[PDB]
Amino acid sequence: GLASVLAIGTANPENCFNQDEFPDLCFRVTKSEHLTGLKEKFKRICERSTVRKRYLHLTEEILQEYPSIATYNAPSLDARQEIEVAEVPKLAARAASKAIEEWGQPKSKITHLIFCSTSGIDKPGVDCHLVHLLGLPLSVNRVMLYTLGCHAGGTVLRIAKDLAENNVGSRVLVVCTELTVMTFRGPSETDLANLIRMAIFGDGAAAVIIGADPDLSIERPIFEIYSASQTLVPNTSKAIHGRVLEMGLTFYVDKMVPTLVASNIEQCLDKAFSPIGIKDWNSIFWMPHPGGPAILAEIEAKLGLKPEKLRATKHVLSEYGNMSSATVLFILDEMRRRSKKEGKETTGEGLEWGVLMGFGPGVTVETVVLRAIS
Template sequence: MGTVGVAGGGSTKVANPGKATILALGKAFPHQLVMQDYLVDGYFRDTNCDDPVLKQKLTRLCKTTTVKTRYVVMSEEILKKYPELAVEGLPTVKQRLDICNDAVTRMAVEASQACLKNWGRSPSDITHLVYVSSSEARLPGGDLYLAKGLGLSPETQRVMLYFVGCSGGVAGLRVAKDIAENNPGSRVLLATSETTIIGFKPPSAERPYDLVGVALFGDGAGAMIIGSDPVLGYEKPLFELHTAIQQFLPNTEKTIDGRLTEEGISFKLARELPQIIEDNIEGFCKKLMEVDGFPDKEYNKMFWAVHPGGPAILNRMEKRLDLSPEKLNASRRALMDYGNASSNTIVYVLEYMIEESLKMKKENQGDDDEWGLILAFGPGISFEGVLARNLTG
């Protein structure tokens, strides 16, 4: 597995006293890189399926998702060891969890190590751990195995968010913000880790919606360090987390439906999901912004770090909020390079956001957008949002 991280760079903006800030980012991936152009043939070969109608449907979906590359834990070695994963209807949850529990811990440790390296301080300075995953299930949970893998103190206070799906990264950020601001001097490690093996299945005409996931989702891990009152000279704040809120939309429980069964996780994503998000996104953003009296509808004067659930969601948001095309650049790049990696993806979006801010500063292309929104949507349907300041530009 390889690890990648982003350093903070210089910071000319100063964080407000007592407000939580993101102090470092890091990410990690499994070694298997999948090119979208070759995915269809490989998937149908691995699952011994030759249904031309399903193959044509997946080929079409692979183009519409805009994904170019993804990382996955699944490999020829795994399928040789567990051939039952590619057979319809076999009880395989034990086998899946044997693979997933190990893989997500390994990726979470590597992403956290990359993050700690960028932070520049000792793991012993971590006081709290927030761990997010929808790809494992065990007691004790992955939070303990991650703490052990990093050599954290046994007194590190842990919080675990399981099965919150795509909104998990921003939900974890909201929880970490609360911890950091209510425990002066604390440093919170937020780690997310996901693998699609928990839901890998052969194609089936009875489950055409499965092909959307095959064309869209990827694996990996992400990590952030969150704390208030950065130590000057030692820490370089990246984003200030000003306000965070969560909201669920009543009577949408079936729109994103996930079930853990004997055959792993089964997902159903309703067709109306992008429309529901489009119909509710402006009201949610207004609620998030009005907490601090932020000017209404000045959307193009803000940055947008949006979890890229899929291109339809990004397109609908762009249209509803009348955003300039470049506003969702970081989200579209993350989707193209990593697919929808569930809770991890917001880390990749924020990295691209920093990269673009520093590039603008270097090229003297005027002021970047200091204020913006960090957003994600998950089962519930739950909206997660943070009103934030970019401190890197």
């Protein structure tokens, strides 16, 4: 009676930004075309990113309507909130609609809603707005998780497991929706982490249906959530920062995180796969959260992973950017689709067991052991 992923939907904002054109565009819309050396630095980051496309709610049009969001640190929170309290529930609704469509069962069988969002802190929360938009049952048991952020794709699976498995018959709608409206801001010489923010992070929403003991007649598991564990890396608070301030949500990533993550991954991995008797990290399938290309490269190097093992992850980062909590869930989708298309034995690239990991502020590592199905 393991909690299982039964259906997966994803969505993105209408507006697509090619990375090759994003430097030119960004420094124009932020009134920063004069800082030529900094625009050149940003070119270099973009082209080290391996991000080809991102989808952003923000447009040039929206930025003339809200000039404060286009500056570096002018007061802009109220504007960002006006955008996001409205837009977060709509994109969440799109991704969830798609998941429910795949699932094929009525919205009335949904008993739990776990909703993860960095954006749009509101009372009542974007979860209530989503209940009304999507037409969910008023008795739906809600868990609202604000501003966690980038590892929370594992946090939602961790909470979904206990919720699905302790409530007989439950069906849990999990939604991660990440908009960069609250973190977007113009460039600055003195703020280097912010250039990384501006080249890597895109928008996206992902939603899954989790339940334990599916009805094989109407439902089939895609992945089973075997176990889920969170941990704090010692002495690394302030290696990922941010606060909601009057200038919106600030951001700092330290230069240690790719190597720090690569140095802590094996304890997490041993803790997770000892009870299964797995030691060969090339024999499981992989869904690490691609905070950037270097986290992936350091993971590859430290574990001796074969070149193919992160194809799905690199595909999501490439085609959508880093979408914070949602990214791993896109990776879920990408892998199962891919395995059908190649006619693999199982949903997880033909292997039986896999790992999903999220890395975020803390530094926090979320480790989820997944079981493939077919």
